[PDB]
Amino acid sequence: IIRFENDVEPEGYHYLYETENKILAEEAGKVEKIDNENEGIRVKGFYEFVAPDGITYRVDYIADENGFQPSGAHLPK
């Protein structure tokens, strides 16, 4: 494979890998509280990749305590 790595920590984790299919994706999340109640922790992740046509494409996504909050090219300014 082109690339392959995965870190892991009690305060969070990370993911980074690149396939030979011209794909680039990753994932990360940082925890805080534990047991009992919660409401405060969140996770963020995104992925990007350029098609042979040279066309770029990326889609970010993050989940907060309020719920799923989409992002990336899915929201034009």
Side-chain angles (χ1 to χ4, degrees):
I1 176 164
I2 315 309
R3 192 181 308 189
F4 194 89
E5 192 72 270
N6 314 114
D7 289 340
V8 56
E9 282 284 84
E11 305 299 309
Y13 38 92
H14 189 36
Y15 284 79
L16 172 52
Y17 59 91
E18 179 172 307
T19 80
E20 46 167 351
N21 287 85
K22 316 192 173 295
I23 312 178
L24 202 303
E26 42 170 291
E27 198 293 325
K30 298 177 180 172
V31 298
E32 291 286 312
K33 296 192 173 70
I34 183 174
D35 291 327
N36 194 51
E37 292 165 270
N38 52 121
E39 291 290 277
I41 290 63
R42 67 190 305 185
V43 54
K44 45 175 172 165
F46 67 86
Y47 56 108
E48 177 168 17
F49 64 81
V50 61
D53 298 41
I55 302 305
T56 83
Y57 186 79
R58 179 172 186 159
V59 194
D60 185 283
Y61 66 81
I62 60 185
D64 307 40
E65 44 164 80
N66 304 167
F68 201 68
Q69 183 166 181
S71 188
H74 186 46
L75 205 177
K77 310 179 171 184

Coordinates of all heavy atoms in Angstrom, one line a residue:
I1 N 0.8 -1.2 0.0 CA 0.0 0.0 0.0 C 0.9 1.3 0.0 O 2.1 1.2 0.3 CB -0.9 0.0 1.2 CG1 -1.7 1.3 1.3 CG2 -0.1 -0.1 2.5 CD1 -2.9 1.2 2.2
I2 N 0.3 2.4 -0.4 CA 1.0 3.6 -0.4 C 1.4 4.1 1.0 O 2.5 4.4 1.3 CB 0.2 4.7 -1.1 CG1 -0.4 4.1 -2.4 CG2 1.0 5.9 -1.5 CD1 0.6 3.4 -3.3
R3 N 0.4 4.2 1.8 CA 0.6 4.7 3.2 C -0.4 4.0 4.2 O -1.5 3.7 3.8 CB 0.4 6.2 3.3 CG 0.9 6.7 4.6 CD 0.7 8.2 4.7 NE 1.3 8.9 3.6 CZ 1.4 10.2 3.5 NH1 1.0 10.9 4.5 NH2 1.9 10.8 2.4
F4 N 0.0 3.8 5.4 CA -0.9 3.2 6.4 C -0.3 3.5 7.8 O 0.7 3.0 8.2 CB -1.0 1.7 6.1 CG -2.1 1.1 7.0 CD1 -3.4 1.1 6.4 CD2 -1.9 0.6 8.2 CE1 -4.4 0.5 7.1 CE2 -2.9 0.1 9.0 CZ -4.2 0.0 8.4
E5 N -1.1 4.2 8.6 CA -0.7 4.5 10.0 C -1.9 4.8 10.8 O -2.9 5.3 10.3 CB 0.2 5.7 10.0 CG 0.9 5.9 11.4 CD 1.9 4.8 11.6 OE1 1.5 3.8 12.1 OE2 3.0 5.0 11.2
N6 N -1.9 4.5 12.1 CA -3.0 4.7 13.0 C -2.5 4.9 14.4 O -2.0 3.9 15.1 CB -3.9 3.5 12.9 CG -4.2 3.1 11.5 OD1 -3.8 2.0 11.1 ND2 -4.8 3.9 10.7
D7 N -2.7 6.1 14.9 CA -2.3 6.4 16.3 C -3.4 6.2 17.3 O -4.6 6.2 16.8 CB -1.8 7.9 16.4 CG -0.4 8.0 15.7 OD1 0.2 7.0 15.5 OD2 -0.1 9.1 15.3
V8 N -3.1 6.0 18.5 CA -4.2 5.8 19.5 C -3.7 6.4 20.9 O -2.6 6.0 21.4 CB -4.5 4.4 19.7 CG1 -3.2 3.6 20.0 CG2 -5.5 4.2 20.8
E9 N -4.5 7.3 21.5 CA -4.2 7.9 22.8 C -5.5 7.9 23.6 O -6.6 8.0 23.1 CB -3.7 9.3 22.6 CG -2.2 9.2 22.1 CD -1.3 8.9 23.3 OE1 -1.2 7.7 23.6 OE2 -0.8 9.8 23.9
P10 N -5.4 7.9 24.9 CA -6.6 8.0 25.8 C -7.3 9.3 25.7 O -8.4 9.5 26.1 CB -6.0 7.7 27.2 CG -4.5 8.1 27.1 CD -4.1 7.8 25.7
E11 N -6.5 10.3 25.2 CA -7.1 11.7 25.1 C -7.7 11.9 23.7 O -8.3 12.9 23.4 CB -6.0 12.7 25.4 CG -5.4 12.5 26.7 CD -6.4 12.6 27.8 OE1 -7.1 13.6 27.8 OE2 -6.5 11.7 28.6
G12 N -7.5 10.9 22.9 CA -8.0 11.0 21.5 C -7.3 10.0 20.6 O -6.5 9.2 21.0
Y13 N -7.6 10.0 19.3 CA -7.0 9.1 18.3 C -6.9 9.8 17.0 O -7.5 10.8 16.7 CB -7.8 7.8 18.2 CG -9.3 8.2 18.3 CD1 -10.1 8.4 17.1 CD2 -9.9 8.2 19.6 CE1 -11.4 8.7 17.2 CE2 -11.3 8.5 19.7 CZ -12.0 8.8 18.5 OH -13.4 9.1 18.6
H14 N -6.2 9.2 16.0 CA -6.0 9.8 14.7 C -5.8 8.6 13.7 O -5.4 7.5 14.0 CB -4.8 10.7 14.7 CG -4.7 11.4 13.4 ND1 -5.8 11.8 12.7 CD2 -3.7 11.8 12.6 CE1 -5.5 12.4 11.6 NE2 -4.1 12.4 11.4
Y15 N -6.2 8.9 12.4 CA -6.1 7.9 11.4 C -5.6 8.6 10.1 O -6.2 9.6 9.7 CB -7.5 7.2 11.1 CG -7.7 6.2 12.2 CD1 -8.2 6.7 13.5 CD2 -7.5 4.9 12.0 CE1 -8.4 5.8 14.5 CE2 -7.8 4.0 13.0 CZ -8.2 4.4 14.3 OH -8.5 3.5 15.3
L16 N -4.7 8.0 9.4 CA -4.1 8.5 8.2 C -3.7 7.4 7.2 O -2.9 6.6 7.6 CB -2.9 9.4 8.5 CG -2.2 9.8 7.2 CD1 -3.2 10.4 6.2 CD2 -1.2 10.9 7.5
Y17 N -4.3 7.3 6.1 CA -4.0 6.3 5.1 C -4.3 6.7 3.7 O -5.3 7.5 3.5 CB -4.8 5.0 5.4 CG -6.3 5.3 5.4 CD1 -7.0 5.1 4.2 CD2 -6.9 5.7 6.6 CE1 -8.4 5.4 4.2 CE2 -8.3 6.0 6.5 CZ -9.0 5.8 5.3 OH -10.4 6.1 5.3
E18 N -3.5 6.2 2.7 CA -3.7 6.6 1.3 C -3.7 5.3 0.5 O -2.7 4.5 0.5 CB -2.6 7.5 0.9 CG -2.8 7.8 -0.6 CD -1.8 8.9 -1.1 OE1 -1.7 9.9 -0.4 OE2 -1.1 8.7 -2.0
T19 N -4.8 5.1 -0.2 CA -4.9 3.9 -1.1 C -4.3 4.1 -2.5 O -4.1 5.3 -2.8 CB -6.4 3.5 -1.2 OG1 -7.0 4.3 -2.2 CG2 -7.1 3.7 0.1
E20 N -4.0 3.1 -3.2 CA -3.5 3.2 -4.5 C -4.5 3.7 -5.5 O -4.2 4.0 -6.7 CB -2.9 1.9 -5.0 CG -3.9 0.8 -4.7 CD -3.5 -0.5 -5.4 OE1 -2.6 -0.4 -6.2 OE2 -4.1 -1.5 -5.2
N21 N -5.8 3.8 -5.1 CA -6.9 4.2 -5.9 C -7.0 5.8 -5.9 O -8.0 6.3 -6.2 CB -8.2 3.6 -5.4 CG -8.2 2.1 -5.8 OD1 -7.7 1.3 -5.1 ND2 -8.8 1.7 -6.9
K22 N -5.9 6.4 -5.5 CA -5.9 7.9 -5.5 C -6.9 8.4 -4.4 O -7.6 9.3 -4.7 CB -6.2 8.5 -6.8 CG -5.5 7.7 -7.9 CD -5.6 8.5 -9.2 CE -4.7 7.8 -10.3 NZ -3.2 8.0 -9.9
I23 N -6.9 7.7 -3.3 CA -7.9 8.1 -2.2 C -7.1 8.5 -1.0 O -6.1 7.9 -0.6 CB -8.7 6.9 -1.8 CG1 -9.3 6.3 -3.1 CG2 -9.9 7.4 -0.9 CD1 -10.2 5.1 -2.7
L24 N -7.6 9.6 -0.3 CA -6.9 10.2 0.9 C -8.0 10.5 1.9 O -8.8 11.3 1.7 CB -6.1 11.4 0.5 CG -5.0 11.7 1.5 CD1 -5.7 11.8 3.0 CD2 -4.0 10.6 1.5
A25 N -8.0 9.7 3.0 CA -8.9 9.9 4.1 C -8.3 9.8 5.5 O -7.2 9.2 5.6 CB -10.1 8.9 4.0
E26 N -8.9 10.4 6.5 CA -8.4 10.4 7.8 C -9.6 10.6 8.8 O -10.7 10.9 8.5 CB -7.4 11.5 8.0 CG -7.9 12.8 7.4 CD -7.0 13.9 7.7 OE1 -7.0 14.3 8.9 OE2 -6.2 14.4 6.9
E27 N -9.3 10.3 10.1 CA -10.3 10.4 11.2 C -9.6 10.8 12.5 O -8.5 10.2 12.8 CB -11.1 9.1 11.3 CG -12.4 9.4 12.0 CD -12.1 9.8 13.5 OE1 -11.2 9.2 14.0 OE2 -12.9 10.6 14.0
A28 N -10.2 11.6 13.3 CA -9.7 12.0 14.6 C -10.8 12.4 15.6 O -11.9 12.8 15.1 CB -8.7 13.2 14.4
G29 N -10.5 12.2 16.8 CA -11.5 12.5 17.9 C -10.8 12.7 19.2 O -9.9 11.9 19.6
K30 N -11.2 13.7 20.0 CA -10.7 13.9 21.3 C -11.7 13.8 22.4 O -12.7 14.6 22.4 CB -10.0 15.3 21.4 CG -8.9 15.4 20.3 CD -8.3 16.8 20.3 CE -7.2 16.9 19.3 NZ -6.8 18.3 19.1
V31 N -11.6 12.9 23.3 CA -12.5 12.7 24.4 C -12.2 13.6 25.6 O -11.1 14.2 25.6 CB -12.5 11.3 24.9 CG1 -13.0 10.4 23.7 CG2 -11.1 10.9 25.3
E32 N -13.1 13.7 26.5 CA -12.8 14.6 27.7 C -13.3 13.9 29.0 O -12.5 13.2 29.6 CB -13.6 15.9 27.6 CG -12.9 16.8 26.5 CD -11.6 17.3 27.0 OE1 -11.6 17.9 28.0 OE2 -10.6 17.2 26.2
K33 N -14.6 14.1 29.3 CA -15.1 13.5 30.5 C -15.2 12.0 30.4 O -14.8 11.4 29.4 CB -16.5 14.1 30.8 CG -16.4 15.6 31.1 CD -17.8 16.1 31.7 CE -17.6 17.5 32.1 NZ -17.4 18.4 31.0
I34 N -15.8 11.3 31.4 CA -15.9 9.9 31.4 C -16.9 9.4 32.4 O -17.2 10.1 33.4 CB -14.6 9.2 31.7 CG1 -14.7 7.7 31.6 CG2 -14.1 9.6 33.1 CD1 -13.3 7.0 31.8
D35 N -17.6 8.3 32.2 CA -18.6 7.7 33.1 C -19.6 8.8 33.4 O -19.5 9.9 32.9 CB -17.9 7.2 34.4 CG -17.1 6.0 34.1 OD1 -17.5 5.2 33.2 OD2 -16.0 5.8 34.7
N36 N -20.5 8.4 34.3 CA -21.6 9.4 34.7 C -22.2 10.1 33.5 O -22.5 9.5 32.5 CB -21.0 10.4 35.7 CG -22.1 11.1 36.4 OD1 -23.0 10.5 37.0 ND2 -22.1 12.4 36.5
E37 N -22.3 11.4 33.6 CA -22.9 12.2 32.5 C -21.8 12.4 31.5 O -20.7 11.9 31.6 CB -23.4 13.5 33.1 CG -24.6 13.3 34.0 CD -24.9 14.5 34.8 OE1 -24.4 14.6 35.9 OE2 -25.7 15.3 34.3
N38 N -22.2 13.2 30.5 CA -21.3 13.5 29.4 C -21.6 14.9 28.8 O -21.5 15.9 29.4 CB -21.3 12.5 28.3 CG -22.8 12.2 27.9 OD1 -23.1 12.4 26.7 ND2 -23.7 11.9 28.8
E39 N -22.1 14.9 27.5 CA -22.4 16.1 26.8 C -21.2 17.1 26.9 O -21.2 17.9 27.8 CB -23.6 16.7 27.5 CG -24.9 15.9 27.2 CD -25.2 16.0 25.7 OE1 -25.9 16.9 25.4 OE2 -24.8 15.1 25.0
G40 N -20.4 17.0 25.9 CA -19.2 17.9 25.9 C -18.2 17.4 24.9 O -17.4 18.2 24.3
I41 N -18.2 16.1 24.7 CA -17.2 15.4 23.8 C -17.7 15.5 22.4 O -18.9 15.5 22.2 CB -17.0 14.0 24.3 CG1 -16.2 13.9 25.6 CG2 -16.2 13.2 23.2 CD1 -17.0 14.6 26.7
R42 N -16.8 15.5 21.4 CA -17.2 15.5 20.0 C -16.1 14.9 19.2 O -15.0 14.6 19.6 CB -17.4 17.0 19.6 CG -16.0 17.7 19.6 CD -16.2 19.2 19.4 NE -16.9 19.4 18.1 CZ -17.2 20.7 17.7 NH1 -16.7 21.7 18.4 NH2 -17.8 20.9 16.6
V43 N -16.5 14.6 17.9 CA -15.6 13.9 17.0 C -15.6 14.6 15.6 O -16.7 15.1 15.2 CB -16.0 12.4 16.8 CG1 -17.5 12.4 16.4 CG2 -15.2 11.8 15.7
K44 N -14.4 14.7 15.0 CA -14.3 15.4 13.7 C -13.6 14.5 12.7 O -12.6 13.8 13.1 CB -13.6 16.7 13.9 CG -12.4 16.5 14.8 CD -11.6 17.8 14.8 CE -10.5 17.7 15.9 NZ -9.5 18.8 15.7
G45 N -14.0 14.5 11.5 CA -13.3 13.7 10.4 C -13.7 14.2 9.0 O -14.8 14.7 8.8
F46 N -12.8 14.0 8.1 CA -13.0 14.4 6.7 C -12.2 13.6 5.8 O -11.3 12.8 6.2 CB -12.6 15.9 6.5 CG -11.1 16.1 6.7 CD1 -10.3 15.9 5.6 CD2 -10.6 16.4 8.0 CE1 -8.9 16.0 5.8 CE2 -9.2 16.6 8.1 CZ -8.4 16.4 7.0
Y47 N -12.4 13.8 4.5 CA -11.7 13.0 3.4 C -11.6 13.8 2.1 O -12.6 14.5 1.8 CB -12.3 11.6 3.2 CG -13.7 11.8 2.9 CD1 -14.2 11.5 1.6 CD2 -14.7 12.1 3.9 CE1 -15.5 11.6 1.2 CE2 -16.0 12.3 3.5 CZ -16.5 12.0 2.2 OH -17.8 12.1 1.9
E48 N -10.5 13.7 1.4 CA -10.4 14.3 0.1 C -9.7 13.4 -0.9 O -9.0 12.5 -0.5 CB -9.5 15.6 0.3 CG -9.3 16.3 -1.1 CD -8.7 17.7 -0.9 OE1 -8.3 17.9 0.2 OE2 -8.8 18.5 -1.8
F49 N -9.9 13.7 -2.2 CA -9.3 12.9 -3.2 C -9.5 13.5 -4.6 O -10.6 14.0 -4.9 CB -9.9 11.4 -3.2 CG -11.4 11.5 -3.5 CD1 -11.8 11.6 -4.8 CD2 -12.3 11.4 -2.5 CE1 -13.1 11.6 -5.1 CE2 -13.7 11.5 -2.8 CZ -14.1 11.6 -4.1
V50 N -8.5 13.5 -5.4 CA -8.6 14.0 -6.8 C -8.8 12.9 -7.8 O -8.1 11.9 -7.8 CB -7.3 14.8 -7.1 CG1 -6.1 13.9 -7.1 CG2 -7.4 15.4 -8.5
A51 N -9.8 13.1 -8.6 CA -10.1 12.1 -9.6 C -9.1 12.2 -10.8 O -8.7 13.3 -11.1 CB -11.6 12.3 -10.2
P52 N -8.8 11.2 -11.5 CA -7.9 11.2 -12.7 C -8.1 12.5 -13.5 O -7.1 13.0 -14.1 CB -8.2 9.9 -13.4 CG -8.7 9.0 -12.4 CD -9.3 9.8 -11.3
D53 N -9.3 13.0 -13.6 CA -9.6 14.1 -14.4 C -9.0 15.4 -13.7 O -9.2 16.5 -14.3 CB -11.2 14.3 -14.5 CG -11.7 13.1 -15.2 OD1 -11.3 12.0 -14.9 OD2 -12.6 13.3 -16.0
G54 N -8.3 15.2 -12.7 CA -7.7 16.4 -12.0 C -8.7 17.1 -11.1 O -8.3 18.1 -10.5
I55 N -10.0 16.7 -11.2 CA -11.0 17.4 -10.4 C -10.9 17.0 -8.9 O -10.8 15.9 -8.5 CB -12.4 16.9 -10.9 CG1 -12.5 17.3 -12.4 CG2 -13.5 17.7 -10.1 CD1 -12.2 18.7 -12.7
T56 N -10.8 18.1 -8.1 CA -10.7 17.9 -6.6 C -12.0 17.7 -6.0 O -13.0 18.3 -6.5 CB -10.0 19.1 -6.1 OG1 -10.9 20.2 -5.8 CG2 -8.9 19.6 -7.0
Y57 N -12.1 17.0 -4.9 CA -13.3 16.7 -4.2 C -13.1 16.4 -2.7 O -12.3 15.5 -2.4 CB -14.1 15.5 -4.8 CG -15.4 15.4 -4.2 CD1 -16.5 16.3 -4.6 CD2 -15.7 14.4 -3.2 CE1 -17.7 16.1 -4.0 CE2 -16.9 14.3 -2.6 CZ -18.0 15.2 -3.0 OH -19.2 15.0 -2.4
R58 N -13.7 17.2 -1.9 CA -13.5 17.1 -0.4 C -14.9 17.3 0.3 O -15.7 18.1 -0.1 CB -12.5 18.1 0.1 CG -12.4 17.9 1.6 CD -11.2 18.8 2.1 NE -10.9 18.6 3.5 CZ -9.7 18.9 4.0 NH1 -8.8 19.4 3.3 NH2 -9.5 18.7 5.3
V59 N -15.1 16.5 1.4 CA -16.3 16.6 2.2 C -16.0 16.4 3.7 O -15.7 15.3 4.1 CB -17.3 15.5 1.7 CG1 -18.7 15.8 2.3 CG2 -17.3 15.5 0.2
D60 N -16.1 17.5 4.4 CA -15.9 17.5 5.8 C -17.2 17.2 6.6 O -18.2 17.5 6.1 CB -15.3 18.9 6.3 CG -14.9 18.8 7.8 OD1 -15.8 18.9 8.6 OD2 -13.8 18.7 8.0
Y61 N -17.0 16.6 7.8 CA -18.1 16.3 8.6 C -17.7 16.2 10.1 O -16.7 15.7 10.4 CB -18.7 14.9 8.2 CG -17.7 13.8 8.5 CD1 -17.6 13.3 9.8 CD2 -16.8 13.3 7.5 CE1 -16.6 12.3 10.1 CE2 -15.9 12.3 7.8 CZ -15.8 11.8 9.1 OH -14.9 10.9 9.4
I62 N -18.6 16.8 10.9 CA -18.3 16.8 12.4 C -19.6 16.6 13.2 O -20.7 17.1 12.8 CB -17.7 18.2 12.7 CG1 -18.7 19.3 12.4 CG2 -16.4 18.4 12.0 CD1 -18.0 20.7 12.6
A63 N -19.5 15.9 14.3 CA -20.6 15.6 15.1 C -20.4 16.3 16.5 O -19.5 15.9 17.3 CB -20.8 14.1 15.3
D64 N -21.3 17.2 16.8 CA -21.2 17.9 18.1 C -22.2 17.3 19.1 O -22.8 16.2 18.9 CB -21.6 19.4 17.9 CG -20.7 20.0 16.9 OD1 -20.4 19.3 15.9 OD2 -20.2 21.1 17.0
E65 N -22.4 18.0 20.2 CA -23.3 17.5 21.3 C -24.8 17.8 20.9 O -25.7 17.2 21.4 CB -23.0 18.1 22.6 CG -22.8 19.6 22.4 CD -22.9 20.4 23.7 OE1 -21.9 20.3 24.5 OE2 -23.9 21.0 24.0
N66 N -24.9 18.7 19.9 CA -26.3 19.0 19.4 C -26.8 18.0 18.4 O -28.0 17.9 18.2 CB -26.2 20.4 18.8 CG -25.7 21.4 19.8 OD1 -25.4 22.5 19.4 ND2 -25.6 21.1 21.0
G67 N -25.8 17.3 17.8 CA -26.2 16.3 16.8 C -25.2 16.3 15.6 O -24.1 16.7 15.8
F68 N -25.7 15.8 14.5 CA -24.8 15.8 13.3 C -24.9 17.1 12.6 O -25.9 17.6 12.2 CB -25.3 14.7 12.3 CG -24.2 14.3 11.4 CD1 -23.1 13.6 11.9 CD2 -24.4 14.5 10.0 CE1 -22.1 13.2 11.0 CE2 -23.3 14.2 9.1 CZ -22.2 13.5 9.6
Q69 N -23.7 17.7 12.4 CA -23.5 19.0 11.7 C -22.7 18.9 10.5 O -21.5 19.1 10.5 CB -22.9 20.0 12.7 CG -22.8 21.4 12.0 CD -22.5 22.5 13.0 OE1 -22.4 23.6 12.7 NE2 -22.3 22.1 14.3
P70 N -23.3 18.5 9.3 CA -22.6 18.4 8.0 C -21.7 19.6 7.7 O -21.8 20.6 8.4 CB -23.7 18.2 7.0 CG -24.8 17.7 7.8 CD -24.7 18.3 9.2
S71 N -20.8 19.4 6.8 CA -19.9 20.5 6.4 C -19.1 20.2 5.1 O -19.4 19.1 4.5 CB -18.8 20.7 7.5 OG -18.1 21.9 7.3
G72 N -18.2 21.1 4.7 CA -17.5 20.9 3.5 C -18.2 21.6 2.3 O -18.9 22.5 2.5
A73 N -17.9 21.0 1.1 CA -18.5 21.6 -0.1 C -20.0 21.5 -0.1 O -20.7 22.0 -1.0 CB -18.0 20.8 -1.3
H74 N -20.5 20.8 0.9 CA -22.0 20.7 1.1 C -22.6 21.9 1.6 O -23.8 22.0 1.8 CB -22.3 19.5 2.0 CG -23.8 19.2 2.0 ND1 -24.5 19.2 0.9 CD2 -24.7 19.1 3.1 CE1 -25.8 18.9 1.2 NE2 -25.9 18.9 2.6
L75 N -21.8 23.0 1.8 CA -22.3 24.3 2.3 C -21.6 25.4 1.6 O -20.5 25.7 1.9 CB -22.0 24.4 3.8 CG -23.0 25.3 4.4 CD1 -22.8 25.4 6.0 CD2 -22.8 26.7 3.9
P76 N -22.2 26.0 0.6 CA -21.6 27.2 -0.2 C -21.8 28.5 0.5 O -22.9 28.8 1.0 CB -22.3 27.1 -1.5 CG -23.7 26.7 -1.2 CD -23.6 25.7 0.1
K77 N -20.7 29.3 0.5 CA -20.8 30.6 1.2 C -21.2 31.7 0.1 O -22.4 32.0 0.0 CB -19.4 31.0 1.8 CG -19.0 29.8 2.6 CD -17.6 30.1 3.2 CE -17.2 29.1 4.3 NZ -15.9 29.4 4.9

